[PDB]
Design a binder for this molecule. Sequence first.
Ligand SMILES: [K+]
Ligand SMILES: [K+]
Ligand SMILES: [K+]
Ligand SMILES: [K+]
Ligand SMILES: [K+]
Ligand SMILES: [K+]
Ligand SMILES: [K+]
Ligand SMILES: [K+]
Ligand SMILES: [K+]
Ligand SMILES: [K+]
Ligand SMILES: [K+]
Ligand SMILES: [K+]
Ligand SMILES: [Mg+2]
Ligand SMILES: [Mg+2]
Ligand SMILES: [Mg+2]
Ligand SMILES: [Mg+2]
Ligand SMILES: [Mg+2]
Ligand SMILES: [Mg+2]
Ligand SMILES: [Mg+2]
Ligand SMILES: [Mg+2]
Ligand SMILES: [Mg+2]
Ligand SMILES: [Mg+2]
Ligand SMILES: [Mg+2]
Ligand SMILES: [Mg+2]
Ligand SMILES: [Mg+2]
Ligand SMILES: [Mg+2]
Ligand SMILES: [Mg+2]
Ligand SMILES: [Mg+2]
Ligand SMILES: [Mg+2]
Ligand SMILES: [Mg+2]
Ligand SMILES: [Mg+2]
Ligand SMILES: [Mg+2]
Ligand SMILES: [Mg+2]
Ligand SMILES: [Mg+2]
Ligand SMILES: [Mg+2]
Ligand SMILES: [Mg+2]
Ligand SMILES: [Mg+2]
Ligand SMILES: [Mg+2]
Ligand SMILES: [Mg+2]
Ligand SMILES: [Mg+2]
Ligand SMILES: [Mg+2]
Ligand SMILES: [Mg+2]
Ligand SMILES: [Mg+2]
Ligand SMILES: [Mg+2]
Ligand SMILES: [Mg+2]
Ligand SMILES: [Mg+2]
Ligand SMILES: [Mg+2]
Ligand SMILES: [Mg+2]
Ligand SMILES: [Mg+2]
Ligand SMILES: [Mg+2]
Ligand SMILES: [Mg+2]
Ligand SMILES: [Mg+2]
Ligand SMILES: [Mg+2]
Ligand SMILES: [Mg+2]
Ligand SMILES: [Mg+2]
Ligand SMILES: [Mg+2]
Ligand SMILES: [Mg+2]
Ligand SMILES: [Mg+2]
Ligand SMILES: [Mg+2]
Ligand SMILES: [Mg+2]
Ligand SMILES: [Mg+2]
Ligand SMILES: [Mg+2]
Ligand SMILES: [Mg+2]
Ligand SMILES: [Mg+2]
Ligand SMILES: [Mg+2]
Ligand SMILES: [Mg+2]
Ligand SMILES: [Mg+2]
Ligand code: NA
Lengths: 73, 175, 180, 260
Amino acid sequence: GVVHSTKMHRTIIIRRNYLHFIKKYQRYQKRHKSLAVHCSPAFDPKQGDEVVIGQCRPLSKTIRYNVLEVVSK
Amino acid sequence: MRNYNNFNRVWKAPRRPFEKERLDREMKLCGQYGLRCKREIWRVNMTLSKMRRTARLLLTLPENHPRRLLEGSAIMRRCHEYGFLDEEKDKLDYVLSLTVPDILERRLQTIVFKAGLAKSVHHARVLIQQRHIAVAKQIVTIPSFIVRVSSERHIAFADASPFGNGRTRAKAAKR
Amino acid sequence: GIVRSRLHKRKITGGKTKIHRKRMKAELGRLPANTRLGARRVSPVRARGGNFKIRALRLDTGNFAWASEAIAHRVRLLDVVYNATSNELVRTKTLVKNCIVAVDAAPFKRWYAKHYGIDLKLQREWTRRRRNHRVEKAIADQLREGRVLARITSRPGQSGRADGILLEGAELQFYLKRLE
Amino acid sequence: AKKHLKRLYAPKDWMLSKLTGVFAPRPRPGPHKLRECLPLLVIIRNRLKYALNAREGEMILRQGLVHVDNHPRRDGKYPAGFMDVVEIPKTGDRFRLMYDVKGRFALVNLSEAEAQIKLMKVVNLYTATGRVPVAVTHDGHRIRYPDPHTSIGDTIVYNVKEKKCVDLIKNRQGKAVIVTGGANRGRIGEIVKVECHPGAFNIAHLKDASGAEFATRAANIFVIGKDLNNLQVTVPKQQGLRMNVIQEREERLIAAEARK
RNA sequence: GAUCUGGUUGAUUCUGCCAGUAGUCAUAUGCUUGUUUCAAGGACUUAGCCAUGCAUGCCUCAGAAUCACUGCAGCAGGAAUCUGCGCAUGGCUCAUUAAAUCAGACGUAAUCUGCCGCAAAAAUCUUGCGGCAAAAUUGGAUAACUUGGCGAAACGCCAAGCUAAUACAUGAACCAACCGGGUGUCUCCGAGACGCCCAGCGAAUGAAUGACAGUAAAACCAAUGCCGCAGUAACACCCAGCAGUGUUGACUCAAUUCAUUCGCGAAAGCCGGCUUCCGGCGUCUUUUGACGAACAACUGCCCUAUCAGCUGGUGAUGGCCGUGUAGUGGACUGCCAUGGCGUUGACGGGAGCGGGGGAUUAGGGUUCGAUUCCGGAGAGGGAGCCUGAGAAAUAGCUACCACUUCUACGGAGGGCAGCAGGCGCGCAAAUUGCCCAAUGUCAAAACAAAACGAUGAGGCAGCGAAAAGAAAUAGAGUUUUUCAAUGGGGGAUAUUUAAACCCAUCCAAUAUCGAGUAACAAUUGGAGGACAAGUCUGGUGCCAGCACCCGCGGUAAUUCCAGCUCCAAAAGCGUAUAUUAAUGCUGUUGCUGUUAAAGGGUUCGUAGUUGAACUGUGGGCUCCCUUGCAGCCCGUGAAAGAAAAAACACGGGAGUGGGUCGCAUGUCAUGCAUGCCGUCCGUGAUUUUUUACUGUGACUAAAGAAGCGUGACUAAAGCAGUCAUGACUUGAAUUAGAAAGCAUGGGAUAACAAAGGAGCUUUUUAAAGGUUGGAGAUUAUGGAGCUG
RNA sequence: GGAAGUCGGCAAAAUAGAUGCGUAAGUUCGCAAGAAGCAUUGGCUCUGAGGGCAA
Ligand SMILES: [K+]
Ligand SMILES: [K+]
Ligand SMILES: [K+]
Ligand SMILES: [K+]
Ligand SMILES: [K+]
Ligand SMILES: [K+]
Ligand SMILES: [K+]
Ligand SMILES: [K+]
Ligand SMILES: [K+]
Ligand SMILES: [K+]
Ligand SMILES: [K+]
Ligand SMILES: [K+]
Ligand SMILES: [Mg+2]
Ligand SMILES: [Mg+2]
Ligand SMILES: [Mg+2]
Ligand SMILES: [Mg+2]
Ligand SMILES: [Mg+2]
Ligand SMILES: [Mg+2]
Ligand SMILES: [Mg+2]
Ligand SMILES: [Mg+2]
Ligand SMILES: [Mg+2]
Ligand SMILES: [Mg+2]
Ligand SMILES: [Mg+2]
Ligand SMILES: [Mg+2]
Ligand SMILES: [Mg+2]
Ligand SMILES: [Mg+2]
Ligand SMILES: [Mg+2]
Ligand SMILES: [Mg+2]
Ligand SMILES: [Mg+2]
Ligand SMILES: [Mg+2]
Ligand SMILES: [Mg+2]
Ligand SMILES: [Mg+2]
Ligand SMILES: [Mg+2]
Ligand SMILES: [Mg+2]
Ligand SMILES: [Mg+2]
Ligand SMILES: [Mg+2]
Ligand SMILES: [Mg+2]
Ligand SMILES: [Mg+2]
Ligand SMILES: [Mg+2]
Ligand SMILES: [Mg+2]
Ligand SMILES: [Mg+2]
Ligand SMILES: [Mg+2]
Ligand SMILES: [Mg+2]
Ligand SMILES: [Mg+2]
Ligand SMILES: [Mg+2]
Ligand SMILES: [Mg+2]
Ligand SMILES: [Mg+2]
Ligand SMILES: [Mg+2]
Ligand SMILES: [Mg+2]
Ligand SMILES: [Mg+2]
Ligand SMILES: [Mg+2]
Ligand SMILES: [Mg+2]
Ligand SMILES: [Mg+2]
Ligand SMILES: [Mg+2]
Ligand SMILES: [Mg+2]
Ligand SMILES: [Mg+2]
Ligand SMILES: [Mg+2]
Ligand SMILES: [Mg+2]
Ligand SMILES: [Mg+2]
Ligand SMILES: [Mg+2]
Ligand SMILES: [Mg+2]
Ligand SMILES: [Mg+2]
Ligand SMILES: [Mg+2]
Ligand SMILES: [Mg+2]
Ligand SMILES: [Mg+2]
Ligand SMILES: [Mg+2]
Ligand SMILES: [Mg+2]
Ligand code: NA
């Protein structure tokens, strides 16, 4: 996904974009989803960067993923 | 509750109730074959449409398609085994040419009449219902029985009927 | 009673959740122990699966380890000095995991002489053990005073015991500054 | 919690008619999984026809007349499964539960002196108390001192009479395997290459005797011999070779015509 | 079967609606019903209220009988009670409910887990005798019962006296092992002996282990090994190889050592077979498969803006140390920060249990799904809880609210959305029946024998034109009378069935009833048009009435009320209300907008939708084109080398280190042992490309749909059966199922991201500085890289 | 008991400080508003926050 916000402490919001297909009209829609991810101090991502995340045990009310790799800009 | 025995439907009414041409054509068949009601004709209509619908689907597929090979031979085999088509007809395109009288010819009621066991097609109907006809030593009382070509020569009078070695009006006359 | 489910919380959208089932036994919680310093008193609890948890209400003794020496000894608790959650827990002398306590230092001094031959065939081993070995000044000063700071490592409300480890290194200097 | 099993929900391989009753016998926990088993009451009644109903099935079983892996079983809900040996000494019967080429259970008759051997697949390895290595198999056995070269996925040749390991077959390229799950169940092939995907499922590429190629997940294979020519067990009469559906239909029709 | 017809005008050509038409396991109602097979059945309204009866218990050879119980001759059967297991399943219903439940696909390394399978087990000073011995001859209570009873009763109670255990409690030395840690007195020159404390499974805290995988070769010192540095797993004797080697994608996990600290019988049990040992059961603790439970969430899911902002005192989004839980977690206390969601529709309001699936059908679609299988939830409403492996249980307990029953007035009870039944409500839905024979569940349990477990789950009949399949009401002749034939029905040596019933067989096998008006008598709607069929004959006279629409009826009615005749469907046929097609009148495929309804008064403009070209003809062989063979450094240049995965290093890598009988070593040997060029595998340093689309493959409950085979007499069905002390090595084949998720081949059309073009050498020599036996220290010589 | 007294609630009774939450119709958009209404408050022993001046 892509980094959407970095205002929390050691937590970021990422966004996933995809196209959904409607069978009746034979055409697509644009949709998106948001996730909260824990970000270790070993990384320094910025808004707009692309990250790779992995699933882990529940860490808070909304966090279920950890950042594994950052691809800058 | 919790009963899983299946059942379905075998006939459908025409969608124009009073069409002059259709009414006359159907009254021809009832008199010619001695049927009881229009429902017996409409039953034959559904079987033909099922066969023709299947054939159209297969003929769309390419010849080397596996499903066309297996289903195509299966439906042709069934048509030959029941006398709907003669063995000369081999391609799958000839099944689309089946008509209503083609199937009505194979009914047991019209088979026995043309075989010489009955004076008329109405005489054939009562004989079957009265347990006088046997197909391969088996009594059949269903006029709509469809006979197979390999079973045509086995049709004769039953062994328990007076007409062939039975009788184990005359029974009540002598008392 | 007390529950641990998320059904009563708000959604991230801020909207309210409409509940359509009753509370289940598989999501209960229980009241805290609030273990305090005093003469031993415990109460067993029957937990899921038929197992037992020991709920400690009062404790005054425990097992404490000297990490650099890789040994342990049973000593008495003297006081609770620091708690990172709240000052009210120090005031009431509440024993919870990771709080700082002061324990009796006499058994450690006694072991030091028997193992090193120092007072704050066997003689030859004592010379061997002394080689490449020194003692931190900060630890040594506490032993002469009679009390030494330690850190609780068990969970008294879950297991019913209060074990710990003596503070050394930079961790000791951190808490000494907070105390004064 | 669940104690019943509706007949419509039972596995299709048991061959139970939907019109006969509402229920089917629910197998107990045991050596084999519920979805991959054949309960004893089904074997003695619907398969061997020694019992006409459940009442007669109980008389035979509760007397201890049926042995599984050389041990009497008195429970009709016992979950028998793949590779087990069933003996009825009073009638001189010996079978092994296997899969035929269409994925159904098949009872292969066993000669004597080979009813003492069972193949087991290793599914886990761990250390017990006292540093004792232990291997746990697909049928729930625990072997407390396996061969040192054992690895997860290998096959152990086991003597049920004497309770001891006799040989080891390693999972390697060029061995003979049989498929135990999926759409290729019951087919016998030759390991061409195992593709490894960490985290995901590994994929095994196989090739039967005729040269046909197929694949499946690595957890569904079961080593049974060194090579396709020399197996370590007797397989059903198809030898695990799947034939074309059109060809099968023709031959069955031809044989039927010749049968009369 | 990819179809249309009547109604606007004096006529015509349109737009457009109204009416007609066919289906519905879609309901109700009306008129009619001879035979047979197969079936739904108080969901809709009132998750309204309930009289009565029944729906969950279990004993074998194998836990405990002194019934003051029964037979016969102590044996056998055994009422009642204690103990062990189960009652958290099955059955019913659909009220609540919108990232909640559910579907496909995943996770628990975040956890608990009785019954079942395969396994494990060396702790713990007891008993008898008076120091000696060893098959451990352990202890105290309680029911049923007896006595006295209380109370109107109550699935209500009190006291005393007796006695079992697989209930409860206690408790086993020697036989009997291996290994380690800490320590006192003697013999030797640091070694040895002896003495002492502790050393079991599980649990808690602390300290270690849970591998390595890259630059070479020397000296000096102390301590050791072997002969001075050649062999060389490790180890001061018993053991000269008794672990130098757990698993995974990954672990603070499995397991082991050291220190300190706290549930575990050999049931002190029960039966047999052999003549003392042999078998079958039963049970405590530890461990991990299986059957489960609980939590989490990748994509998807109706209408509404006359609902635009929502959340955050008092948890809203995150952080730190804790608490609680079986476990993760704002689940919760304290402190800190200011976040989190929203026109890609948040928040609010409305109607709904979710799927598998049903109806309709050219295709695309529209619509239904309370209801048999799977998942969820509830037991009048609302909370709370004990027991238990598992319940926030309701034919369990506690309280309140609303209803309600008995009473001697003191008190005591109740929960049919289980099966039958009532009352109400409504347009709307059966018998207070028989049985455990089949299918299953429980359990101390095979069946039999003195000797039959329960089961309204379930099955079988009754009622039952919801719906579905087959099929009578005659046939053949002769001039208006002659022949046969058969069922409906009545019966039966009988068959079926748990017993009955229905179906099937028969009306002599010596021996067995019956059609002529075959009264054994077919109905429901119509006859101007749409739409098949009368310009008939009476009555009425804009009345009565018909008419879905157009329209008839005012004295000659093709339409009303009747009689004749005729038409359509037929054991069925009308009517009402919904819904699908008809409908290209919701239009993606596929509508219309000058005048029929409908382009905004004109511009600017943000989300959004859409968006120009280009990096590319391979060539030669037997002028372009067709075909086919075989080779190209497959533009140009330049001959192993440049030219367009590479380079390292691991023996704990490869079923000894993958392919290309006796001679030695060892003998204190169970050494019984040993030898006669590119690929594997794991690690480190360097490599710079997705998505979408398309082709294969993998993974995907049945029932339902499609479909192969099969003369249940045919068919709706079903999965069976066919052929000769048994064979068929019998059969029960295949297919499709949205979207999302997994692996991999292809690169034409496209999408995402980046950039905005002046932030833009290679190699070869030379010089300068800055493994030594092993383990523990010291130093130096060089690699390799650093500059000049 | 609570306006039945009286021409008439005259007179008397009643509300009451401060702090937190909360607050309708109407409107000249300023108000209405202290609208209405609910809750806390003592004593003692502690804890936290809010500063200046020199190295
Ligand atoms: K007109
Ligand atoms: K008995
Ligand atoms: K009991
Ligand atoms: K033991
Ligand atoms: K009494
Ligand atoms: K935490
Ligand atoms: K009822
Ligand atoms: K039964
Ligand atoms: K019935
Ligand atoms: K019928
Ligand atoms: K008759
Ligand atoms: K007239
Ligand atoms: Mg995994
Ligand atoms: Mg007009
Ligand atoms: Mg005119
Ligand atoms: Mg009707
Ligand atoms: Mg009959
Ligand atoms: Mg009858
Ligand atoms: Mg119902
Ligand atoms: Mg109701
Ligand atoms: Mg229950
Ligand atoms: Mg249930
Ligand atoms: Mg699922
Ligand atoms: Mg002992
Ligand atoms: Mg006990
Ligand atoms: Mg390891
Ligand atoms: Mg060793
Ligand atoms: Mg463990
Ligand atoms: Mg959840
Ligand atoms: Mg707060
Ligand atoms: Mg509802
Ligand atoms: Mg439903
Ligand atoms: Mg409803
Ligand atoms: Mg259900
Ligand atoms: Mg419940
Ligand atoms: Mg009720
Ligand atoms: Mg229990
Ligand atoms: Mg309850
Ligand atoms: Mg009840
Ligand atoms: Mg009284
Ligand atoms: Mg109640
Ligand atoms: Mg009805
Ligand atoms: Mg019995
Ligand atoms: Mg019943
Ligand atoms: Mg029932
Ligand atoms: Mg009649
Ligand atoms: Mg009759
Ligand atoms: Mg019947
Ligand atoms: Mg008339
Ligand atoms: Mg006409
Ligand atoms: Mg009508
Ligand atoms: Mg007249
Ligand atoms: Mg008319
Ligand atoms: Mg429509
Ligand atoms: Mg159309
Ligand atoms: Mg239009
Ligand atoms: Mg206009
Ligand atoms: Mg204009
Ligand atoms: Mg373009
Ligand atoms: Mg060239
Ligand atoms: Mg290598
Ligand atoms: Mg008052
Ligand atoms: Mg007055
Ligand atoms: Mg006044
Ligand atoms: Mg206002
Ligand atoms: Mg105020
Ligand atoms: Mg006012
Ligand atoms: Na908090």
